[PDB]
Structure formats: structure tokens, C-alpha cells
Amino acid sequence: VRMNVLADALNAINNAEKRGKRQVLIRPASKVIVRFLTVMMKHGYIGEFEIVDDHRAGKIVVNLTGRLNKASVISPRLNIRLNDLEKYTNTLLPSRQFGYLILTTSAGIMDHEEARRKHLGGKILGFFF
Amino acid sequence: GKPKGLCTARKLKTHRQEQRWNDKRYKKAHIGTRWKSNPFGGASHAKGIVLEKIGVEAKQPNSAIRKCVRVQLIKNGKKITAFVPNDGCLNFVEENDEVLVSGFGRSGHAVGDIPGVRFKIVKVANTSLIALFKGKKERP
Amino acid sequence: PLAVDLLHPEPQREIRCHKLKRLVQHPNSYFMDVKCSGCFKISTVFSHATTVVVCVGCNTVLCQPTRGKAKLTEGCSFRKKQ
Amino acid sequence: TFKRRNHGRNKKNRGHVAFIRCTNCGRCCPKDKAIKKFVVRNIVEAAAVRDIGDASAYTQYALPKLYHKLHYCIACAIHSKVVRNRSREARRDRNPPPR
Amino acid sequence: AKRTKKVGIVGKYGTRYGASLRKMAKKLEVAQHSRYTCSFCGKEAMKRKATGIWNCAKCHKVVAGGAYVYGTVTAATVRSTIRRLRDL
Amino acid sequence: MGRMHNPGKGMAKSAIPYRRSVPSWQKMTAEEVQDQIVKMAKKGLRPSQIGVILRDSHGVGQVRRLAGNKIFRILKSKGMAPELPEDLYHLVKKAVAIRKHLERSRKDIDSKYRLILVESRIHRLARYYKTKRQLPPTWKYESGTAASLVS
RNA sequence: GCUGCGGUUAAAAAGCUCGUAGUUGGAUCUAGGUUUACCUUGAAUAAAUCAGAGUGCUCAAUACAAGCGCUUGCUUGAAUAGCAUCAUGGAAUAAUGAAAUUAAUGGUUAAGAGGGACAAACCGGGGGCAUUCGUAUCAUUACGCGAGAGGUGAAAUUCGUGGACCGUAGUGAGACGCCCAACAGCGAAAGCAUUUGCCAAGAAUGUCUUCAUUAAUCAAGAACGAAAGUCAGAGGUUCGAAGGCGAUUAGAUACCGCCCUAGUUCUGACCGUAAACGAUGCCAUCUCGCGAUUCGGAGGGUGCCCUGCCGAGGAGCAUCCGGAAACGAAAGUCUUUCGGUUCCGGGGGUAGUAUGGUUGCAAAG
RNA sequence: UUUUUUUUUU
């Protein structure tokens, strides 16, 4: 039974990136997936993507730029306080010079740098680098 | 795989406790019969009375007769076998002597080629065995 | 190949792809108006019909259910309704 | 150490396969595991076909044949040299040997 | 409440005659004191009168059956054989 | 078909068209189709068969698209809902048939296994319908009375 | 080992399935140009200790002091940091509720989730009950034969002129379904194979049919579960534990041969264990090429052939990555660890032993 | 056809 569309999507992206493919198809698309991909694109780790509509959950087609090392989900969505954000980033990200921790906060889905700028905690969604 | 849900704290904690008992160290330190089984009753040393002097054949490939002594502990009256270290030190130990006994070093396990001996002598007649061996002190 | 247009698949591949695994699902079935020699009444029928569809007036069997597409009675033709 | 990928049998999609009794030993061996040999021979050895023909009571008689399907357990097959051990690489070859 | 755990009807025998003998008697005692569906009126009203005699309380039919069961397996197979021969 | 108690990873299902509009050639009216559905319900057919007949003969691809409502909803509004939902009714009927078969053949261990699975499905479906208030809260599947209930 | 271990072979996947608690659960409602849960900020929150600011106790551990003028004096430090409750703001994520005189009157979609329906010269050693047939083994009858037959490495025990063994033709019993028969099929697993009839069930495929989250895994709980074994009743052909003989041997309580008892078979109950093995738990998802094979479908040619055809199986050889390696298209997508969930392991023994509990007629589980 | 053994340490 499927229980994490984001986990499936990120696994598919990772596999396609490893194989060196130029496009990847993501099944059950969702708002969370779209926001995650938007953050990745804004930081330049993927190209453009299209949301194919089929009167159902829909699909996505993402253009891979051959620049992403790993995009992983963190389950369960543990609550991250602004005080332990530093510990979580040090643990999960390869370096302090690159890589992003994606959180969902009351403001919205963003990366850990923007969350620290706005002094927001929240539940962790995943990370990419 | 282990549970990963956000509300599985009870399962994780209970499973950890259940499996800690399959750990030799944890079980040895929490079984409950430690005091009644350990001859020293959880102490480091114990005073006892020498009953006889015995010789223990060293394990293979070594060959020798280790000079041990049978002791009865005062605190509980349990019988143990203790090693008399150093050379010719069995002479200092007479029968019906009050000896201080300590562990052999491996926390209740045999040491070296001596089989089944887990204790050694530290003092005889309130005198240090090392002092007697070195000649610092003499038999009371 | 690494570079494949997942957005615009080749029409022949889309035809020779499973109905569910296409980019957007589309059934391989269709509705057909059937003409039977005789009464010459056009009758709409589902391609994969599992019921014996019967002429309203002339009471002649038009299709026979099968494992896949329904089998049309001999002498009856069909045309795909748009 | 696992010697063979098929574990010495030919059992796939199956739980249980009935056994056969070997030809020599009589041991029970699963039918997929037993070494099977279909043998078609002349009813009379090659050295006596001429004698039988020259003694034939008919102008033209077709000499019949013996058909035997033989099942061997691994032990009685190796001993009889119906099958032989192979190198590690040659073990994976599945084509029948030349006859 | 369940009065007896396992003895059931043979609880009348107390501790006598041996466990295995009482166990053997239990099956047949239950069977002979049970009520069976009549094949004529269709109601569960067949009761044993004497060994081999089964009377229906409703339709008043008397049938020759088993000693402790309304019908026996051998009689059933014989009936099946006769019916099969009749059909073919 | 899917897998509930069996190891079947089937991939055969209807693929509804992307088009949500009635075809131009489709001239049956939204009210006429409702009348046809009520007529078939009078005759005694259930929604699964009503839809099949409408698709095979009358050319109605999706009654939801044409009439704007699901067949069971139409029957409910017209006050023709059955006592038992269709799937529950069929499961109960299957259980009754398997039992009747086992009364005769008591060595059919496979039939015993199938009965166990069917009754487990019955109980789960009944729980769901009781949650949705489609069954009386005290409704319970009784082996003895199930035959009359489903007949 | 939550972060963060391992379970094919090193210890470790329950035989298999159903199932309550528990855990976990698809997508979807203002993008643009009522409740909770959670996060932020405050409030309430003894010292000593820990961290930490200041300060030449001669340094330090400490301590909480002290430093300046000039006398009648001034100024000081003894900081700051360190579940539940209340309040504030935030409205993503995750749960939860609303409707079966006017107004657009009020039902999200129909999951490459799940269930149910409908189709089929459908598919199958799937299951059950009856039934038909076949040689063979054994016994026995009739007829012929004439002295060996059987068995082994060689023999012997054994059978044989009361005429065996061998032939031909019958008769009877019980067991078993050869060849076809396969890297074939079905079943949850255990397992399943002579013909036919009946009974209920099911897979896959087809589907513009229906319901609409009904789902995954599952402590306790429950069904099934090879062989042997136990109880009762029938059968007792073959083979055959135990037993008895003949060999072999130093011995031979064995291997070999002969005669056999329980058993092997049927019916109704027990037991619940196997190297019950793929020594690999289940559900979902992604990653490679090739040509074969079983079932169904689509499109053509003449049951067969073709379609680099579509699904679903069961495999094999071109195999990224992985692995201690053997090897694995999963045992890969894991220090770049993190989809959900159940069970299990923690150096070797003692030991699956003792004791207690429970199940069983016992054996034992 | 038969074919059992090979003290301790190094």
C-alpha cells in the first residue's frame, strides 16, 4: 500500500539521476511534491517540470540537470525546534556550504536557511544536496 | 524493520527493554541472584580460613603444578579455591590461617593456564604476601 | 536512451501501450452503431459488450459476449461512433 | 556454500514432486532430480544382426527395437559414469554432451 | 453456567467404570438421546424409543434405524448404491 | 482483480475516459435515463447490472456523466434502496452457498478455508457499513439466519 | 543501534493463512494578476552544583570580594544562562465537524488502492463425493514340462519330483495410476497426475459496470498443516521398523540375502512437529538488454505462423550497484543511513536442559 | 569381497 508519495517521487528522481536520464516521471503528484520540487528548482538542483492532468492525482515530468547528489525524505515528520535546527542540519547535510533541509512550517514549505531567517520551526519534510 | 511511526514510542521502549535481557552484561548486572551466587557477595575482597593446600595441573600446552589453597569464607562460610602467587609462597601459608582473598582479575573467570581458580591470596596472617615474598616483613 | 520525450510520446507507442500506463489513461473500447442486413435499424452497441444485445423490433441477436470484444452476428457490420 | 543455483533439482513453481525408484539401487529420488535417460537400441546386439537376418524366416523383416526410460539416483548415476563431475565453470553448461 | 467441563451426559456415572469407557459411552449416549430431523415432516422430532426404533413426535412415523443413531453410514451407502443402480 | 486474501497482483480495471461530457450522438435525456434506471430497479436489477445494460444496449457510457448522479444515489432518492448493499448481499450469498455445500461434503477442507475468508470479508464490510450508518447498528451476520436473510 | 546494528550461508524470517488491540494509511477545496496536534514569543519557575562575567586569595583549586583618596570620604560588584500550566501570534503539515422570502439551493474525483457484479468451444495434477479402466504384485485353478528355481561379490538360509521355476488361459484380493511428464500448471502452505458425473470455490484476462477509502501489517485469539506416531472400526496385496535366521567380520546387536510383526490402505477422531528450504516475512514503489515458455486479450496470414504487440505468471543468460566472499535484477536504489509494518538475534557451551505454567490418551508440543 | 588404529609438547 502506498503511504508516502513524496518518498516515492524522491526515490524515482534519485534513480533517474543515477542512471543519467534527462527526464523523470513522478506518479501520484501532490501539492507537497510540487512545493518540494519548486524549492529544488529555485536552488537550481532540477530544471523545469510539468504537471500532467488526468482527472486524478495526476503526474509530473521533471527535467534533470545532472547536479543533484541525493534527495531524501525524512519519515516520520519529526518536529524541529529552532534551537535544535543546528543539530539536525549538522547531522543530515554533507556540509554547511551546500545542501538544504526542507521543512513545512505555518508560513509554508521552505528550506532551513529561510526558516532560520524567519525564526520558524516546524516539521521536517526532507533534504537534498 | 523497526517501527518508525511518530506514535511508536511505547513499542520502541518496551522492545528495547525486552531485548536488553538477552544481553549478558545487563542480565549479569540485573538478574537478582548476583549477591547469593557470587562467593564474595558483591565485594572486592573477603577474609577466609585455609582448609588445605592443593595442587592444580596447568592446562595444555603448559605443564606445572600451581600451588592453590582451599579457603572457607568467614562472611558466608562458602568454600573457594585461591591461588597463592609468587614462587615458594605456599610455605608462608599454614593450615588454619586467616587469609585475605581477592579476585584473580577477570571478574569471576579463570586466568591463564590455571583451570577453575578465580581467586588469589593477598594477605596471610594480616601480612602482605608481596611483603613476605620481598622480605620486607616476616611471619607474625 | 537517456533523452526521451516523456511529455510527447510517439503515437504508435501510445497505441501499443497499456491503457493504464499511458501518459493519460484512455480506454481501448469504443461505441459502434451496428447495421444488420434486414431490418436495417442502426443500433448502438458497446464494443466489449457482455450482454446479448437484441434488435428492438426484429429480435435478432446482434452481438455475442466473449472473453474480449463482443462477436458480431454474421451479416451484421458496424461503424465506430465518434 | 551453495553449489548450484537450482539446488540440484528442476523444481520451480512447485512444492512437492513425486519420487521414482532408481534403476539399480531402488532408492527413492524426486523425478525432477533423478538423471533420466531415454535409450533406444536394437533388440539384437550389433554383432549378431547379420546372423539373425541370415536366419530370418521372411524375405524382408524389420528388426524391432527396445525402448527403455531409465531413472538413476545421483549416486548410482555417478558410479555408473552415466554422469560425471565437472569443473566449477563447466558445471553451469546445460547443453547435452556430444553422443 | 457450564456445569461439567468434559464429562457431560456421562456425569451420571461419577468416577466409575474408567475414563476411556466413559468417553466411549459419551458419544453414543449423546447420539441416542439427541433429536433428529424427520425426513417425512421435516421437523426435529425423531426420538429413540428402543434400540433401533425411532419415532417422530409430529407425524407419528416409526422408522427402523441404528441402535444409537437415527441412520447408519452403511445404510446410507447402501441407499446410495440402490439409487445409483436405479438411475443407470 | 486485486488481492485481499489471495496473492494476485492483477492489473485489469476499467479506464474511464478523460472526457467528462456526454457525446454529441448521445440523445438520451437526463430524465429519460433516470426513468429507465427506475424501470430496471422495478424489474429487480441492481445498480451493477443496470449500468451494464445501459452501457451495452442504450449506449450510456457513464450514468454519472449523463444523469449527473450515481445509480445507487438515484435509487435512494426514488426510495428504492435495498436492505443490504449489493456487495454485502453477494458476499452473504456466497457464504450461504459454501455452507450448504459443506453440510453435504464435510471433507472439503479447502471449502472450509474459503468459508473462513468469506466470513472475514463479510464482517469487515459490515463494520464499514455500520460505521457509515447504512446498516442497523445491531446488524450481525448470523450463520443460521443468513440463508433466509439473503433469500 | 531513536539518531544507529543485524536475520541466504557467520546467532537470528514464525510452516502457512485469517484476525482483535497497537502502529501506519492515496489525491482533492483562494491560486493568481469549529476544534485539536505542531512552531514562535512571553509569564510562573530556592539556593548549593555545572556553564559563565568581574575581581593578582603571592599563582591555582578556591573565595565573593574589593578599588580609590587622604583622616570627618566617594564609588562600587556579588551578573547572565540554564516536562506539565497559562497567554500571544502563525494557519503549511496530520487528524476532526458540517446541508442527503430568497439562492447556481446542498453529494470533490473515481487511485496503474481495495471490495463486489458481468463475460467467456474460458484456464488449471486446485478441493470433495461417487464411478470406470489398466497392466503389474501376490495367491490360486486347469493343462504341459521335466530338475532345478531363487539369491549373492561368492554363497548360504529358503522353495522344489507331494512336481517347483517356467509357459498359456482364467479367477480373487488389496495396493498403485508407468510411459505422456516438462527449469509445465494449480493451491495460503502442506500438497495435487487413470475415465466419467455431480457439487461448491478460484486465478489471470476483458470491462466507458457498481461502492467510494471500505486499506497494509498484525500482541491475544483461530483454521489448515508431510511423514512418523496414538485411539476405534474395516481391510489386509506389496513393502516392511521391531523380531528371527543365512552370510561378511576380530566381533557385526550393521551394511548384503531370506521369513516376517506393527505399520503402509480406507472411515471417524487425536498430535501440531520436518533441511515444513528459496535455510531469504508481508504490502507499495524505482532501476537493463536479449530471446524463449504458461494463460488471457488486440491486430493480421494461412490448428500453426507473424506483430522488436498488451497484461499476468514461472524461469534463464546481459547484468547498474551491493556483498567478507560464494554470489544477488534483488541479497540493488544505506555513513548519500530515515515508504509502512510484524517476528526474531546479541561469543561458544550448559541447553531447548532444570523448575513452574499450559495443551495431549500417550509420545510429546 | 575384506581394508580397524597411530601417546603429550615442539
Short mmCIF file of C-alpha atoms in Angstrom, two decimals, chain B residues 22-136:
data_model
loop_
_atom_site.label_atom_id
_atom_site.label_comp_id
_atom_site.label_asym_id
_atom_site.label_seq_id
_atom_site.Cartn_x
_atom_site.Cartn_y
_atom_site.Cartn_z
CA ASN B 22 19.26 -11.02 26.02
CA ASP B 23 22.46 -9.09 26.82
CA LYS B 24 24.94 -10.94 29.01
CA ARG B 25 26.22 -7.81 30.76
CA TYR B 26 22.77 -6.41 31.51
CA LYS B 27 21.41 -9.76 32.67
CA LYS B 28 24.50 -10.41 34.77
CA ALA B 29 24.12 -7.00 36.41
CA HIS B 30 20.36 -7.18 36.99
CA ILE B 31 19.40 -10.86 37.34
CA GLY B 32 18.80 -10.58 41.10
CA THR B 33 20.73 -13.61 42.38
CA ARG B 34 24.12 -11.91 41.99
CA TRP B 35 24.68 -11.48 45.72
CA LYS B 36 23.64 -15.03 46.62
CA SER B 37 25.67 -16.61 43.81
CA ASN B 38 28.90 -14.59 43.95
CA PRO B 39 31.08 -16.04 46.74
CA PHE B 40 32.18 -12.55 47.81
CA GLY B 41 28.61 -11.26 47.75
CA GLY B 42 29.49 -8.30 45.56
CA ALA B 43 32.64 -7.35 47.47
CA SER B 44 36.17 -6.97 46.13
CA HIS B 45 37.98 -8.91 48.87
CA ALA B 46 36.99 -11.40 51.54
CA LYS B 47 38.61 -12.94 54.60
CA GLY B 48 38.69 -16.70 54.95
CA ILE B 49 40.27 -19.64 56.74
CA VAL B 50 42.66 -22.01 54.99
CA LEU B 51 41.45 -25.62 54.97
CA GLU B 52 44.13 -27.37 52.91
CA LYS B 53 46.82 -26.88 50.28
CA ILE B 54 46.16 -28.38 46.85
CA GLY B 55 48.00 -28.51 43.54
CA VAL B 56 46.26 -27.83 40.23
CA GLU B 57 47.67 -29.21 37.00
CA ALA B 58 48.24 -26.42 34.48
CA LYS B 59 46.29 -26.52 31.24
CA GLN B 60 47.88 -27.56 27.98
CA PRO B 61 50.28 -26.92 26.38
CA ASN B 62 51.80 -25.86 29.70
CA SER B 63 52.95 -28.28 32.39
CA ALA B 64 53.25 -27.37 36.07
CA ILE B 65 51.55 -27.74 39.44
CA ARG B 66 50.04 -24.43 40.52
CA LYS B 67 50.02 -24.22 44.32
CA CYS B 68 46.48 -23.29 45.32
CA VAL B 69 44.73 -23.37 48.68
CA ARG B 70 41.19 -24.23 49.74
CA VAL B 71 39.57 -21.48 51.81
CA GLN B 72 36.31 -21.11 53.72
CA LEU B 73 34.98 -17.56 53.75
CA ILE B 74 34.02 -16.11 57.11
CA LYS B 75 31.18 -13.90 55.91
CA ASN B 76 29.13 -16.76 54.44
CA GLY B 77 31.05 -20.00 55.00
CA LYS B 78 31.40 -20.77 51.30
CA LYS B 79 34.34 -22.82 50.06
CA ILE B 80 36.61 -21.48 47.32
CA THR B 81 39.98 -22.27 45.76
CA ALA B 82 42.51 -19.43 45.72
CA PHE B 83 45.87 -19.14 44.01
CA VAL B 84 48.98 -18.37 46.04
CA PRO B 85 51.06 -16.20 43.68
CA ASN B 86 54.84 -15.84 43.54
CA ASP B 87 57.50 -18.51 43.95
CA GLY B 88 57.72 -20.58 47.11
CA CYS B 89 54.98 -18.53 48.74
CA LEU B 90 52.93 -21.59 49.67
CA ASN B 91 55.37 -22.03 52.55
CA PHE B 92 54.15 -18.81 54.17
CA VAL B 93 50.58 -20.16 54.20
CA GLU B 94 49.91 -22.61 57.03
CA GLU B 95 46.71 -24.53 57.59
CA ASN B 96 44.05 -22.80 59.69
CA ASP B 97 45.29 -19.33 58.73
CA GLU B 98 43.29 -16.14 58.20
CA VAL B 99 43.84 -15.07 54.59
CA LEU B 100 42.58 -12.10 52.60
CA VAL B 101 41.38 -13.25 49.18
CA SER B 102 40.80 -11.09 46.12
CA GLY B 103 39.60 -11.72 42.61
CA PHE B 104 42.02 -13.01 40.02
CA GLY B 105 41.46 -10.16 37.57
CA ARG B 106 38.85 -11.31 35.04
CA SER B 107 35.69 -10.76 37.10
CA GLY B 108 34.95 -14.31 38.16
CA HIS B 109 36.74 -16.20 35.38
CA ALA B 110 39.86 -18.34 35.37
CA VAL B 111 43.14 -16.65 34.44
CA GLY B 112 45.95 -18.18 32.43
CA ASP B 113 46.58 -21.91 32.47
CA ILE B 114 45.07 -22.42 35.94
CA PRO B 115 41.70 -24.17 35.46
CA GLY B 116 38.74 -23.34 37.67
CA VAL B 117 40.52 -20.90 40.01
CA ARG B 118 39.04 -17.40 40.23
CA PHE B 119 40.67 -16.05 43.40
CA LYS B 120 44.14 -15.27 44.70
CA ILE B 121 45.68 -14.58 48.09
CA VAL B 122 46.63 -11.03 49.07
CA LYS B 123 47.39 -11.31 52.80
CA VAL B 124 48.20 -14.15 55.18
CA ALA B 125 48.10 -13.65 58.95
CA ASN B 126 47.35 -9.97 58.32
CA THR B 127 50.64 -9.74 56.42
CA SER B 128 51.03 -8.94 52.75
CA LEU B 129 52.09 -11.86 50.58
CA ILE B 130 54.13 -9.46 48.45
CA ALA B 131 55.87 -8.13 51.56
CA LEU B 132 56.68 -11.66 52.71
CA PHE B 133 58.00 -12.57 49.26
CA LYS B 134 60.14 -9.42 49.11
CA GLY B 135 61.40 -9.92 52.66
CA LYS B 136 60.03 -6.58 53.88
#
